[PDB]
């Protein structure tokens, strides 16, 4: 029941046997027992809430597992290590996670590789706050999902990608994503309903737009006045496009106030709306 002791025995058995120890056969049989040791250690380290210790312990058990020839259950250990570091004081987490994917990827387990990949960028954005490396992951991950026939998940990821791409300034690179995720959302009459927001975003994102890129994305849109859901998408957009093309930072800022009534603006929208709000002012003042 002594973690420190286990961590020691594990060492005394994790070494290619030779001479009187090796006997006739051996190898993987020992290193595996060692892995079980470090695992038990990390287990009680997490029992005593030492987490950090538990994490590094799992790191040892995992690294050892690789030295045995068993990438599968190994990578799973790397995962455990990540869950430990994450709910711990060190920052390691990220590392372990990367070391996990390299396995699931090389092994061919892209399904799970993407399952974790999204959690990866999710941490590289909620923790390290490094969106530049988060988007890269949300994207490479969505590629895998979209490959596993799994359209729904692929779209979840794409939504993440585009969503944070507009915050980083990548507006056009965002509208493209919204267009694609929009044309690939109508093939499912179980998503048509939400296809609105997509057009709303793609039309809001402006790469210093000067013409009707948005007026064109709003016209491509098929609104059904008797299909009231659309009241939270185009109807507003048109009024904003006019308030933009007419250098009026009042009609736009008034429409954002009104629409903010029938439909609560979320963080994202707010930030972008203000960005477009200033593209008008600077144009009134040129």
């Amino acid at each position: 029941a002594e973690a420190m002791a286990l961590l020691a025995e594990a060492e005394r058995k994790v070494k290619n046997s030779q001479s009187f120890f090796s006997g006739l056969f051996g190898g993987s049989s020992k290193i595996e027992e060692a892995c079980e040791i470090y695992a038990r250690a990390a287990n009680m380290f997490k029992m005593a809430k030492n987490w950090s210790a538990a994490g590094n312990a799992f790191c040892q058990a995992a690294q050892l597992h690789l030295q045995l020839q068993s990438k599968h259950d190994a990578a799973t250990c790397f995962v455990d290590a990540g869950n430990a570091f994450k709910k711990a004081d060190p920052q390691e987490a990220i590392n372990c996670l990367m070391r996990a994917i390299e396995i699931y990827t090389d092994m061919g387990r892209f399904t799970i590789a993407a399952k974790h990949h999204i959690s990866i960028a999710e941490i590289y954005e909620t923790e390290l706050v490094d969106v530049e490396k988060a988007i890269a992951h949300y994207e490479q991950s969505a590629d895998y999902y979209k490959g596993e026939e799994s359209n729904s998940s692929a779209n979840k990821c794409l939504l993440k990608v585009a969503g944070y791409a507009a915050q980083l300034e990548q507006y056009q690179k965002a509208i493209d994503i919204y267009e694609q995720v929009g044309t690939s959302a109508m093939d499912s009459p179980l998503l048509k309903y939400s296809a609105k927001d997509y057009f709303f975003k793609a039309a809001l994102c402006h790469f210093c737009i000067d013409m009707l890129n948005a007026k064109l994305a709003v016209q491509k849109y098929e609104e059904l006045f008797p299909a009231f859901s659309d009241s939270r998408e185009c109807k507003l957009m048109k009024k904003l496009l006019e308030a933009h093309e007419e250098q009026n930072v009042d009609s736009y800022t008034e429409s954002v106030k009104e629409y903010d009534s029938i439909s609560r603006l979320d963080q994202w929208l707010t930030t972008m709306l203000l960005r477009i709000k200033k593209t008008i002012q600077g144009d009134e003042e040129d």
């Binding site: 930072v249 009042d250 003042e285 040129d286």
Partner: protein, 171 residues
Amino acid sequence: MAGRSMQAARCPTDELSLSNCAVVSEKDYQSGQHVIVRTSPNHKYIFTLRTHPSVVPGSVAFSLPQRKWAGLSIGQEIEVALYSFDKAKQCIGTMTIEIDFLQKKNIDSNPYDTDKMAAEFIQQFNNQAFSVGQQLVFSFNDKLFGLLVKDIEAMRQKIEVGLVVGNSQVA
């Protein structure tokens, strides 16, 4: 005097942009001298200079209001030449000005005493050039406004461009 070549720039701070003065470098002109901008063979304007350690030698900085008036762009070439007014027949004794709120997003119903305005107007725009139809900005009590000279009288004839002095009344 022969008129040299310069380059239109942007106003340094937000104080000189409220004085309706062409900010220049000390290595070129001196604060107090008047000049005449020359863009095209048919476009002539008159501004007031005001040096500042932020100006780059070989360029004159103008404020947005002045740009929309003299039709100047940021990065264009223009000719600047010294200009001396005729205080013997061009002095401004009475200049009507169309005042409104500059920053639209900053308009209230509170009443503003004109007497205090015309007082802080000359105390800041003394010894400067003002043309009929010129667009600038006024700062009364840390509040920005949008002026617009409509008529100018001598100290009573009607002139196109004059020079505001100390004993200059403003309406």
